[PDB]
Amino acid sequence: IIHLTDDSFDTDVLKADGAILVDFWAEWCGPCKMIAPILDEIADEYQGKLTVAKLNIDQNPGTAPKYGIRGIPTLLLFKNGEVAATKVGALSKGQLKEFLDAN
Amino acid sequence: IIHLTDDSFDTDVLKADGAILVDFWAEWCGPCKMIAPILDEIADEYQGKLTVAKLNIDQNPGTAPKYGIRGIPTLLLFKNGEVAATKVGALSKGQLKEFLDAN
Amino acid sequence: IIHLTDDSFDTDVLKADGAILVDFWAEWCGPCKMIAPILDEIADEYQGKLTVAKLNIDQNPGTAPKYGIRGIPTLLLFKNGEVAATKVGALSKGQLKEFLDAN
Amino acid sequence: VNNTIVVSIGQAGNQIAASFWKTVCLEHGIDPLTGQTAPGVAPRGNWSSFFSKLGESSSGSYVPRAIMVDLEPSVIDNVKATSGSLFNPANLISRTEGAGGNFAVGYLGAGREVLPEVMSRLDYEIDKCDNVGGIIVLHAIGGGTGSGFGALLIESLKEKYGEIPVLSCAVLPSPVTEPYNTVFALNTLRRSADACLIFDNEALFDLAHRKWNIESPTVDDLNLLITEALAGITASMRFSGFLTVEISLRELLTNLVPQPSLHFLMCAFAPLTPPDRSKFEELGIEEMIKSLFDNGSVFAACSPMEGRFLSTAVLYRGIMEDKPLADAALAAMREKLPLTIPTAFKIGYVEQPGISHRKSMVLLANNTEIARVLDRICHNFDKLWQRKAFANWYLNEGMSEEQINVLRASAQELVQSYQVAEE
Amino acid sequence: VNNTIVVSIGQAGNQIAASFWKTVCLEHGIDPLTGQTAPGVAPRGNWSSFFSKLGESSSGSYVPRAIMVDLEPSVIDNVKATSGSLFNPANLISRTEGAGGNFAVGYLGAGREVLPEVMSRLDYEIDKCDNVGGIIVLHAIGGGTGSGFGALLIESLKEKYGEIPVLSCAVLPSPVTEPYNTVFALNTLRRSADACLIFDNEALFDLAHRKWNIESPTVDDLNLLITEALAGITASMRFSGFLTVEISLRELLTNLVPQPSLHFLMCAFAPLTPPDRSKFEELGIEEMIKSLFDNGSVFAACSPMEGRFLSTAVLYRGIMEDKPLADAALAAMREKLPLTIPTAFKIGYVEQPGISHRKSMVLLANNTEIARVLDRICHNFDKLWQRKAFANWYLNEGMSEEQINVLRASAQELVQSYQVAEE
Amino acid sequence: VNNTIVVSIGQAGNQIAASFWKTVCLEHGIDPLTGQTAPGVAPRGNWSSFFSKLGESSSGSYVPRAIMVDLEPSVIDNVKATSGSLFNPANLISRTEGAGGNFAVGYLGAGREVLPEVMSRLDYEIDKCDNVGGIIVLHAIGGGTGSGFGALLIESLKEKYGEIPVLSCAVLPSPVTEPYNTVFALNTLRRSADACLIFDNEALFDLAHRKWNIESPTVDDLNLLITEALAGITASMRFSGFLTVEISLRELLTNLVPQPSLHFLMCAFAPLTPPDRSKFEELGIEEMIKSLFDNGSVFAACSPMEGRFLSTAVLYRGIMEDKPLADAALAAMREKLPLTIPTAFKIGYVEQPGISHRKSMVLLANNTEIARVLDRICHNFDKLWQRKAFANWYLNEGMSEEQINVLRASAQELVQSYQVAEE
Numbered sequence A, B, C: 001i002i003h004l005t006d007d008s009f010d011t012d013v014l015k016a017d018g019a020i021l022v023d024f025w026a027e028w029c030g031p032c033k034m035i036a037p038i039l040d041e042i043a044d045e046y047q048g049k050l051t052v053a054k055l056n057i058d059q060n061p062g063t064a065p066k067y068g069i070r071g072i073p074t075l076l077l078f079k080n081g082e083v084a085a086t087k088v089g090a091l092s093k094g095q096l097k098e099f100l101d102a103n
Numbered sequence D, E, F: 001v002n003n004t005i006v007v008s009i010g011q012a013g014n015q016i017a018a019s020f021w022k023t024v025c026l027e028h029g030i031d032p033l034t035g036q037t038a039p040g041v042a043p044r045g046n047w048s049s050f051f052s053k054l055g056e057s058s059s060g061s062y063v064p065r066a067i068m069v070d071l072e073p074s075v076i077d078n079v080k081a082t083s084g085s086l087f088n089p090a091n092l093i094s095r096t097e098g099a100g101g102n103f104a105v106g107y108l109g110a111g112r113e114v115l116p117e118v119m120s121r122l123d124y125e126i127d128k129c130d131n132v133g134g135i136i137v138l139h140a141i142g143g144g145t146g147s148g149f150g151a152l153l154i155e156s157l158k159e160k161y162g163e164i165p166v167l168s169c170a171v172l173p174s175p176v177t178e179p180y181n182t183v184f185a186l187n188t189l190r191r192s193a194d195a196c197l198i199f200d201n202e203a204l205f206d207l208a209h210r211k212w213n214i215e216s217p218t219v220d221d222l223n224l225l226i227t228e229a230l231a232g233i234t235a236s237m238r239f240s241g242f243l244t245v246e247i248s249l250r251e252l253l254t255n256l257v258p259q260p261s262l263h264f265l266m267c268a269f270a271p272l273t274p275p276d277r278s279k280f281e282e283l284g285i286e287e288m289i290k291s292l293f294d295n296g297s298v299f300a301a302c303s304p305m306e307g308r309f310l311s312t313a314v315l316y317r318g319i320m321e322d323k324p325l326a327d328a329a330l331a332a333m334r335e336k337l338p339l340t341i342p343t344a345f346k347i348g349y350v351e352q353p354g355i356s357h358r359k360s361m362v363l364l365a366n367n368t369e370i371a372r373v374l375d376r377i378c379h380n381f382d383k384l385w386q387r388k389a390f391a392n393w394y395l396n397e398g399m400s401e402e403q404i405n406v407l408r409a410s411a412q413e414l415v416q417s418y419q420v421a422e423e
């Protein structure tokens, strides 16, 4: 489980080798808590293939506005320093996979 | 597309060799207009096997009463000078075929 | 069709060799009449395998209370002098069989 | 589109035939007393399978592809009395004597005399078919016409036409010389019929008494049961539609008969609800399918579940309220059946209901418990033949003593075939 | 996940190709003028089957795995004018002359000159595939580029790559030298294509006039019909989902082609409702399935029901309102079809609707009535060749008189194959 | 109706056995502390498959067809403490020493001493069966009793009874001498078991921690997962009904095992919802089926989707809200699975739900990724055997050094079998 700050985003996400999934979230977001246990399973089954990161938008208000986030939870797939795909809202552990499989 | 009058019915329909389907109809009949494009397709797919005729009951009020027509549209199948079968009301291009296939 | 009294229960049901099905019933019971024609079919198809008996609880009030009957119709399966299984209420001729097949 | 000719022989045959044709007319909207339809209207369904058209549409007629043969004239006289101008008068053939319950009279005696006329009517019916798909022979085998001439005609049919499927629907006597005639007829039904569907009078009697409350059931009651089953089996051949699974007699027997030596069939029907309540009381799909496969529903005094199924067809018709449920149920039955020889499990569907039930089913099975019905018969035959009961009846009629031993042995060869299929 | 490359040759080919790619972009949410998606979003579905990704996600692009070849430059110029930065400019190959409706120019003349460039682009596309599952060749065979170079390139494709499935989608001329070019192309389509799906311009014309009320139908109208069918056939390869039955070109042709000598296919589509009403007027499943199997719905001027089906696939996509009904209907069709050579009846389902219908179906069939379409062609060829109409056109171009007899005989060998399959 | 005997060996085996029998009692309405039912009532379902009746209905009892064997007495003592008068006291066999985690003690030492008693109880149970359909052996193979005596008894079972199907359900250790015992047991499970279903403790641990939030999972937690799967697999054998697809152990293994050399199975369960919410939170069919086929749901530390399926059974039970949806889903899975050796895809349905879920599914698969689990084991064995870690433990106990090489090679022959099946 990788926690991020605004200061660490550059190195952790953008300068990163290999694919990375970022969960922009908050404590006061019902649906965000819903997928917290789901995201842990993917951190196992996509070992080496993916790294899973989290950014809490309350304590780090600087990053989300840069990416045009419309709400939370927002899953962002990064490859180099680039957004590959986007998932908005809480979802099944199965729809998440089909999303990861194709990109 | 064969148009009929009361005067032409005898030769065109009754003295006719081979099977013939007559559509008694009117302009002020919703359902009659519904099957006008349908009847054209059958005029193609049943070449030699059938001839398709139309009689507008307003301008030719003399014929329908002779055949006990209860309303429009009425499809009448003739072989010699005889009514083989009867279809009342607008229908699918498929139900029309199953009707033509059996008789 | 075997009718029983309180006096005949001992010999007919309890001292009996082989399996026996007892229908506790009444005339004023709707559902009891419902299965009267059903019970006749089983008396045929389970020849030797089963004997089918009836006890009318109005004219023989002594027996049902001994077996903890909660209502009618009640089917009781006896083997020796022992209740093998219990069916309460009117049922299909098919559910009755699956009940008889298993016990 | 396939044509079927129905030939009925003897009392039972013709009385059943009359009931069958009346029902089929009603299903197709054909006037059962005149062969006509209302002015301008054609019959429903694929009417030409069982009917031919005579003349113009005005004064014309729809004529059952039917031939009725008897020696005694009472039954065919009755048909003429009750059926207006439905039949072709040339197709109702009778003589004067009955066969007096003597198979040999029908096969060798008076039966041989009627054959050229009957065969000539077959010729005419056959040739006036676009494509003949089968011949159904309706008869009882406990008497002497249905059995003797039934035997004679099926043999004759197969020699002259060969390839045409011939199905016998044969009524069996219920526990007189009936056991003798049954056994003699069985030989031909074994060797020459492409298939034989039995209707066991013993079972029919019970069902009518049991399920229907008839203290003294008549032959009319028994014929109701047969007629429903016949209507239901023939529905695949007589209707078409978006969901209607069209099935020929050819395709049906192909699926029901795994070897030529195992071609005896039994059938069950559902609902067996009394006609008294027919449309007011309905079974759901569950109870209906359940009943269809119940030992108490088969038109044979025996228990198909205690034997083995060689093959099976479920022929459904009418309303389908819940197709996922029916498929789930049939799949479950398919995995529950005692099996042998590899099996078939065919499902047919016809949209058109019959005239008495919103939905109904016929189960046809090739099952080894038919051996029981047949065994019952042979035990009665042996009981009389051991002491030569009415033996002179048949001896003085052209059969030889040793040749009836051959036919008792022939039927035994068929009863052993089904016993071997079980183990 | 399988990759497909689509090669389009000549006027018809490329105009259809452009319409196909625009539709596929719209299905996947890819901007059809730029190959881009909205900021941050990926395309829907399995986009990589028909597209490759160029560069980063910011300024990057999704590029049709497409090559377009012509001799005359007008059509490819038009593609450049209407399609922004969608295509790889290196994959749009043209010259200067047209082939003047001369097959021999495309196969032996100017066509041979374009081949190394076209083949080199194929190399590049092939190698940049994770797993290549097939090549689709889009072309008309009445002209000289699609026919000649189409013939040349399929032959070339099979020699160099061998195992890769190659499907031809070939447009046939409607009743000039068109009958000559068709026949010459057919030889290669018979011997070298793994399968060939015909699109009969005669049928397309009729459907557009009849079903859609277009007095003077244009090629744009005809291409709508083709595009829908192509989108629909390729949907099994371009989408995934909980209910989506994924089917490769390999699996599809395997099921549709029972012998290498019988690999010509026809197709039907439903609904053929006019675009005018497309979303406002819907057919129910009943009418839709009914229509799909109707003689008036096939993209071939002939009647599949009067012939025999060797094989069949029904490819459904979009909303499924009533799956028990659709299964009941398809089962009924399956038992109604005239059959041969053992048959296959495959059913595919894709959740994703196309862009114009909430639900749609494509029927692909290997049916013997394709012989009729082919017969029509050969009769026209023979009518000109009997009197050597434009014969010098082809003689002065490298073909010999006896070798075109070989190709007329070659096509005859294919027409006799399908006639033999019927009886 | 088929009878099953369940033999449980060692700690894990017996603790799982106790949990299994308690659950099965509850499913059948049998008092799990006394073997009794309420006054007058019979158990639900086909109880006689797994239970026999003792005596009259008044003071009588329903007795698990069960035998429990251990060397150490703690676990069987605990069973006696928690299970009233459920078991036959004569069927709970123990001694005094544990096998100290030594396979050789169980196979050659103290194990040989217990065998005549255990075999004699098998005799008695077998003979009191109307028709014995299989024996299930419940055991862990990381210790010395389950592994050693488990090996001894399966071998013994097959020599004496031959034709009776024997299924092993074997628990594998999670990454001491466990790798040694596993490998030694595997030989017998390879050669003598008709099939072996693995339960990988590593996967069970993860699921309990992951899906259920248990920081420190206990063996009780792991046994819940196993018990559900065992209840679910045995439901086809323990119930009947209008829609219930009855399936014997024979029929099941026949469909799951394509060759005797490939008889190792894995299983998945759904829903894996935490017991905490079990009846309050339900999955729909979609999510449920989706989950069933997910890599994170298998009771094996590996990924079935990255390997190939040789065979598959989906065993559904309980409420069916939407059968068209479930059939559509399973059909889609069937076309999505990586395949080899021809495959089977069997679907079972049982009406009766288990005690904790309104509907549940078990997936049994013969899949080649079982090689990964097995590989993990062999790498640990080799890591110890390369340096002869606890080798004297086994050498001083009757095994010879070269004969354990044979067993390491034997297991390698099985791991190569599944690797060959993949490519």
Ligand SMILES: Nc1nc2c(ncn2[C@@H]2O[C@H](COP(=O)(O)OP(=O)(O)OP(=O)(O)O)[C@@H](O)[C@H]2O)c(=O)[nH]1
Residues within 6 Å of the ligand: D009, D010, D011, D012, D013, D015, D016, D071, D072, D097, D098, D099, D100, D101, D102, D140, D141, D142, D143, D144, D145, D146, D147, D171, D172, D173, D174, D178, D201, D204, D219, D220, D222, D223
């Ligand atoms: N189910 C049914 N059975 C019948 C019917 N009529 C007669 N039977 C039975 O058929 C057997 C007698 O055969 P029949 O058909 O009456 O004799 P036949 O060949 O027509 O005439 P003869 O040779 O002259 O006696 C007996 O078992 C009767 O019980 C009937 O209408 N329905």
Ligand SMILES: Nc1nc2c(ncn2[C@@H]2O[C@H](COP(=O)(O)OP(=O)(O)OP(=O)(O)O)[C@@H](O)[C@H]2O)c(=O)[nH]1
Residues within 6 Å of the ligand: E009, E010, E011, E012, E013, E015, E016, E071, E072, E097, E098, E099, E100, E101, E102, E140, E141, E142, E143, E144, E145, E146, E147, E171, E172, E173, E174, E178, E201, E204, E219, E220, E222, E223
């Ligand atoms: N359905 C359809 N048919 C077309 C289209 N364009 C041309 N055709 C038909 O295709 C045939 C002519 O083939 P073309 O593709 O135009 O000729 P070409 O090989 O591309 O070019 P040249 O060899 O230079 O003549 C004729 O039968 C036309 O009716 C189109 O866009 N759609």
Ligand SMILES: Nc1nc2c(ncn2[C@@H]2O[C@H](COP(=O)(O)OP(=O)(O)OP(=O)(O)O)[C@@H](O)[C@H]2O)c(=O)[nH]1
Residues within 6 Å of the ligand: F009, F010, F011, F012, F013, F015, F016, F071, F072, F097, F098, F099, F100, F101, F102, F140, F141, F142, F143, F144, F145, F146, F147, F171, F172, F173, F174, F178, F201, F204, F219, F220, F222, F223
């Ligand atoms: N899933 C599960 N695993 C268990 C359970 N009990 C023990 N194990 C595992 O089983 C393995 C040890 O095998 P045991 O059955 O305990 O040993 P044994 O043959 O019974 O007894 P000894 O030979 O005397 O040691 C280890 O991998 C344990 O983690 C249990 O209740 N459930």
